[PDB]
Amino acid sequence: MGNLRLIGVPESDVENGTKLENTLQDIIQENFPNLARQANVQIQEIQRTPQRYSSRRATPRHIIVRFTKVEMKEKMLRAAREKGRVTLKGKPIRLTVDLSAETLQARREWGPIFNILKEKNFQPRISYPAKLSFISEGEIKYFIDKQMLRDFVTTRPALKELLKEALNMERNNRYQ
Numbered sequence: 290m291g292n293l294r295l296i297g298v299p300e301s302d303v304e305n306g307t308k309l310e311n312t313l314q315d316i317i318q319e320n321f322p323n324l325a326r327q328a329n330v331q332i333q334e335i336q337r338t339p340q341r342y343s344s345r346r347a348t349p350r351h352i353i354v355r356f357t358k359v360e361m362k363e364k365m366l367r368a369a370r371e372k373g374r375v376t377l378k379g380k381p382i383r384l385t386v387d388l389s390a391e392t393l394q395a396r397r398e399w400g401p402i403f404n405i406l407k408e409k410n411f412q413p414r415i416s417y418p419a420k421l422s423f424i425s426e427g428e429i430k431y432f433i434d435k436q437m438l439r440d441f442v443t444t445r446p447a448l449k450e451l452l453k454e455a456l457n458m459e460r461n462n463r464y465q
Contacts, residue, residue: 291362295352297382309335312377313354316384320375321368331357395419398435401455409451436464 298312313335318325334355344350356362369375369384376382399421406413406423413423421438422431425448432438439458442449453459 291356291359292386293354293356293362293365294385294387295354295382296349296385297380298349298352298377300349304337306336309337309352312352316375316377316382317365319377320372321365324365324368330361333357392418401457402438402452405451405455 295313295316310332313332314330317330324330332354336353337350338353339350354362356365366384366386374381375384396415396419399415399419402421403413403415411423411425413421416422420431420433422429424430430441432441435456438452439456442452442456
């Protein structure tokens, strides 16, 4: 599911799926010795893109890696950030992923709610994409959209007052 972007892999006439897979494994060993030792990396597919359409830019085409375990992919990214230097066969390369701007906006919207809950010993935590979860009265509650949070507070006046400013549900009668 989780897809990773590998940038800076030179091209070769003899390129083929098998060789590509070996390449990724090599990267792991070169920069992430820990990952290589574990040997718990399950890759589903590795291919070059665009396979049939030439790249408008003079730079080398990118390789897309699809990992079986989303968690595993995330770990790899973290490792790269820590090392500060990732190389393939001694040459410098870059490892990154594409993220949607919508996600960032969501986090900002939840900003007020998160901070207030922290102060009040609610233990607020955020999970990808932008789901809000926290512990209240001894039980764990999860909400995906701010709309849910509104429907929830209606039944606990204390909570409503605390979050009143966070949700800003006192501007326009209509939603959106």
